[PDB]
Design a protein around this ligand. Structure first.
Ligand code: NAP
Ligand code: ATR
Ligand code: FE
Lengths: 378, 378
């Protein structure tokens, strides 16, 4: 099974094509991150929507970590303005917020509780056909969220998933100018997100040749270019920006695995892509020892980078962490804070629906010793 | 830009899926190649359709390399029956005929010459929104028509296109069981079409990273696996089947170039896949000699296969043609018939829309020269 609902416009200055894509439309709403205001990209985009003869209304400065509580502040304003096209311009959380917004805006009657996964034993009601077009313009590189029909919200501090094709964007615009404004830390952290997505997508149970083609290329590109991107090279920024969407196309179809689940639960420690990379080598080790499939697949990636064995890949990834100056896990959290929460973290990683796609099904106890190997810096 | 309308369903016995996809509809028309009847797959298809509770009607023995007059006789039939779902089961010829039929079924006020790409320069009448669902099921590996928006009909021993996303199939089902009954020359010819698609789609002016990913995976897979497939290795057949569609996705988006334009105008000579294989090494040499871009992109492909230079790849291709018994051009057509037509072929190739996407635009004189190079078996 391989599909892609989203239509992808890439290119230097491709933001200008927002002119073509809004034709026909009356009242366009842009949700935007702070930085997209500051660096003037929000202005540019506002021009294009006027250019095309439509009303535009902007909310900038949306906070990280999407939540219902946050969305509920705007929602009244959004209803007042009544847009017939949504545009998200920002990172993952701007785009994911905008997806959740479409649901509430197009289907006001729906109950949030009816229609959100929390764990693997959650069945929700499916989401009915929605109507309002969604254009996604990512400014990091990147979350993949601009091609995916998934969105992750908090209500009352609890993490929820919403999963439907209806909220996968109709168009994504990939303009390398935008992520050239990333500071090096955010370049690094989101860039490792891509690599980790790539590798998990390649080693789930539902991988296809088609999703494999996008994963492999994304991996090859991030390995080659990310160190240069982090240091600010213009070309490199553009190459990793496209690789981020490639990996998005891949895990849209193939889903993800144990590293992601573990990094979801460890999210209070620090940033999502940072922890992902920190756990990756340990998760790879676990998967390869227990699974003849994982070992084969890691080995295939290794060869695509001009090495040989699954051991080579794990070492390649440890080395790339060291190169880019990724912290040890115990430079972020003290040992008692950690060992307290570590019982409850391995519990709820077990109840995550993503481990159905992992090439091994771990028990809660094995998961715990993984969190602890990684703290050991083994 | 990158997009994919077609939902792809792949895997062993995935033909059994027809039944879920037709759920909802009442009158199914299957158009099939003769071989699909002979090998029992047509009966299998009909059962699945009946099982979903719809009336089925089959027409089998659609001709290879269809002409425009194929429409005129079959179209009466469709109207007679009046389907709300079309299924094409066969090679590219059959899928293209089904495609063409949808146009004249759903939009009865059109005619081939209005809407068909004849001249580069005289643009044609656009095709309006059509309505009838179309499911493609390729049995060769392959023309890639199961994901493309094109249909190729002969008028007067020359190939022209209809192009619109309205005739890109809604679903493609990829069951390796079907292509496993290809006789080895069909498997050779359609298999080398994949290789040529990949290389051309990698080298157009409009190649994106996204199409490249599909194109490169396609090229690698075919190079490794096609020799085994031609002998009849069951696994190899599966692998080249999925690759055929990868190449399709690539050239849906990146288009094709001079080799295909040349093949289309020389269609009166032989099978599409064969002619392409014959011209390709000459098209590559020509492009390398005129274009730094072509030279560098060929080297990239070369290195993915474990060689160095554009010249390595040209020789790889020559040596695979020989390994697979691909005949010389001088064996397929006599000298004086060729010499009497090569001016006309070159001129019509030059007015073909595809040569705008070629890295270099060649003169009518240069196209003629390339045809002759090919003939001399240089
Ligand atoms: N639209 C596009 O994007 C695109 C691109 C390139 C080429 N094309 C077009 O597609 C055509 C090329 O088609 P193709 O290479 O797929 O082959 P094809 O021309 O559709 O069929 C070739 C032959 O293969 C036989 N056959 C097919 N499947 C078989 C099976 N499973 N077992 C045994 N025999 C089998 C058929 O015999 P029977 O007839 O007896 O069954 C037929 O005579 C050309 O006309 C070309 O113009 C389209
Ligand atoms: N192009 C850019 N330049 C500078 N900072 C950027 C940026 N894109 C995103 N960021 C910042 O990087 C952070 C990461 O955003 P995010 O949480 O959406 O990342 P991700 O895409 O990984 O989900 C944001 O807090 C954002 O700050 P503002 O919202 O204040 O702009
Ligand atoms: Fe072809």
């Amino acid at each position: 099974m391989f599909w892609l609902k989203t239509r992808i416009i890439e290119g230097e200055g491709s933001l200008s094509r927002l002119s073509r894509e809004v034709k026909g439309h009356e009242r366009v709403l842009i949700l935007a991150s702070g930085s997209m205001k500051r660096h003037g990209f929000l202005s540019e985009a506002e021009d294009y929507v006027k250019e095309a003869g439509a009303e535009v209304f902007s909310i900038a400065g949306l906070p990280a970590e999407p939540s219902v509580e946050v969305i509920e502040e705007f929602l009244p304003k959004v209803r007042e303005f009544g847009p017939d096209l949504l545009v998200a311009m920002g990172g993952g959380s701007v785009i994911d917020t905008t997806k959740a917004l479409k649901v509430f805006y197009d289907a006001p009657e729906l109950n949030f509780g009816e229609i959100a996964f929390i764990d693997r034993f959650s069945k929700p009601k499916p989401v009915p056909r929605l109507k309002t077009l969604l254009i996604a313009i990512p400014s990091t590189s990147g979350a993949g969220s601009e091609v995916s029909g998934a969105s992750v919200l908090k209500k009352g501090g609890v993490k929820y998933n919403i999963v439907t094709p209806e909220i996968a964007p109709d168009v994504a615009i990939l303009d390398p100018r935008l992520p050239r404004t990333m500071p090096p830390e955010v370049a690094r952290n989101s860039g490792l997100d891509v690599l980790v997505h790539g590798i998990e997508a390649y080693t789930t149970k539902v991988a296809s040749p088609f999703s494999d083609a996008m994963a492999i290329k994304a991996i090859k590109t991030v390995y080659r270019w990310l160190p240069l991107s982090v240091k600010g090279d213009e070309e490199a920024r553009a190459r990793v920006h496209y690789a981020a969407t490639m990996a998005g196309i891949a895990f849209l179809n193939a889903r993800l695995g144990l590293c992601h689940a573990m990094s979801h639960k460890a999210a209070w420690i620090g940033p999502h892509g940072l922890l992902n990379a920190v756990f990756l080598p340990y998760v790879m080790e676990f998967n390869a020892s227990k699974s003849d499939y994982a070992r084969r697949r890691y080995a295939e990636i290794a060869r695509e980078l001009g090495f040989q064995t699954a051991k080579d890949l794990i070492e390649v990834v440890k080395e790339l962490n060291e190169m880019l100056g990724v912290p040890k896990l115990g430079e972020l959290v003290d040992e008692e804070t950690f060992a307290s929460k570590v019982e409850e973290m391995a519990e709820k990683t077990y109840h995550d629906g993503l481990i159905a796609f992992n090439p091994v099904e771990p028990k809660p106890e094995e998961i715990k010793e993984l969190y602890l190997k990684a703290y050991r810096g083994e």
